[PDB]
Amino acid sequence: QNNNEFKIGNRSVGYNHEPLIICEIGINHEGSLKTAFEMVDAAYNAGAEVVKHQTHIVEDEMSDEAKQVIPGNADVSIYEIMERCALNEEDEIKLKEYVESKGMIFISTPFSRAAALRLQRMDIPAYKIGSGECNNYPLIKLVASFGKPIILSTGMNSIESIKKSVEIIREAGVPYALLHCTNIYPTPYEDVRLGGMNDLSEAFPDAIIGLSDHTLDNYACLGAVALGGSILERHFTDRMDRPGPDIVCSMNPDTFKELKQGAHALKLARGGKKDTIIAGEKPTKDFAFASVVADKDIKKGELLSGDNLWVKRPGNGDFSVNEYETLFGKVAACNIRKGAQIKKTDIE
Template identity: 50%
Template sequence: MKIAHREIGPQHPPLVIAEIGINHGGSLDVAKGMVSAAHSAGCEMVKHQTHFVDDEMTDEAKQIFPPNADVSIWEVMERCALSKDDEIALKKHAESLGMIYISTPFSRAAADFLNDIGVAGYKIGSGECNHLPLIRHIAGFGKPIIMSTGMQTVETMRPSVQALDEAGVEYALLECTNLYPSPPEIVSLQGINELRAAFPLAVIGFSDHSIGPSMALASVALGACILERHFTDTRYRKGPDISCSMDPAELKFLIDRSREIHTALHNPKQRTGPEEDVYRFARGSMVADKDLPAGHVVGATDIWARRPGSGEISVQHFDRLVGARLTRAVKRNQQLLWSDLDGVTPLANA
């Protein structure tokens, strides 16, 4: 898939998304500072959350208290939501730095607003990943979609994925666990493989709410093409998502290490050119283990392999030498040549 100018898939370095989310606490200045910090760490894409509370919730939400907050979910979002003008300014700031700006709409009105301001793509959160009317509405804009799949199974995801397929949009599915933070006991790295097997048209990624970069990096080794983590410019801020947020140093670490893992992931099992110098001293060459006369029939106790590996016959040919007749006398520890052995066909070393 492609969002703006960024190609995303197994052949490309993992896309690391810094989710600012609501960590700015409703301050445009703080939000801009977080975007700048993410850019300085080498991040290509930032993600926001677009909350129009009146279109997103009913009054019952004022009685629901999230496990990571001490006020109702209504009050959390009301405090942290940016105004339309502020979000436009935040998007402009990110794009002025060359970054890609996307956001998660939590309502139909938010989705329409994001389309109006020209976002390059959409993120659908785990809470909305079974909201078929909203998914169809967002997919109708024809833009690429990244969808988290937390709190879902492969089977419960099928209708949502079918809606994306029917809309003909490019999409990614992110394995996700929705506890903030998520302990390893409930994080599912297996989910990456399960999503790939079940939905072959999807780009697969990992939305991480654990503490530290370990789970996200492990997901790259399993083929995750997108890594999304909450981000803050400093962990000294207060907010419901700060505990599972990375700071600029960890963001840079995640970007750099994930690219290294991606590079190694695509290397086949083989001896490489840079290893040749090591090969010459680390491998064993076949030698006589005692003084042996010409015409001697070689037994298993007559030969051995010792470093360096610069000899003509590698240790891998040990068994082939047993039973051969020597064409000349050899001394103990003398490297053997193919021409020393009658009745053995020379073979190249591997």
């Protein structure tokens, strides 16, 4: 499919690498640092490599009007949701320390210029841009200027729209990933359109391609690995009985383990060429291919024909079924017994 790669710290990312699962705890901690640590713990214990946060600073990321608009998966204002779940800088720093104290990579999504500038002071290894901010070219310009790689969610945007963000990233010269995404919480299967992944890499050949997902299970993310995705992102929780607008479409430690397992299998099985010769198939070839046999007794000097020849397993005959017809017209040099393979010495 392709050979693009870049590193997030020490982790190589790309088609020829192990697909990377981003556990976004996001606002699932409900603004509690203690809950965020329990979620980071569940992710460590499940084998996660990367915890992603959301860096919310309510005054810089929304104007007064956001206190009157309700998101689709909640019933209060988006302003109220972020004032309730936002971690301040002192605690977000503690989150990053904790995540790395558990051996894992911390990245986050900035929603504002102030949030973007806070993460650069923390010196995170790479930056996630969410689907809302995929058309936020002034913000993309700022993050790309930090010189880290950029993982850009691409939901709710067209190729034409994304191309303007991608020109900005290329200009800064940082490597980048494009994540196909659908921003309904949760997302019906029929709205995933995994074909959108091929569309994205056909439109931008230099990009790592993966999927951000908000369906109820793993099927979409597994399908994306089969298609060549290198990065899979689901929301993450320690347990499903947590409160919060994104908990519903999150994975828990067990389903992460399923996803990590399917991702590994499909990383091996995907791709390749039809025509490749698999050495392990040879004993099956040798016994199951057909060889040309006599279909009846054939007298010395009689002509071989489609009436006195046929084909039978196994494959060690002098003439393969591929050469069946080239024996027509040839003359019997011996008496040939019915059911015997046609040997070269059976014809003049």
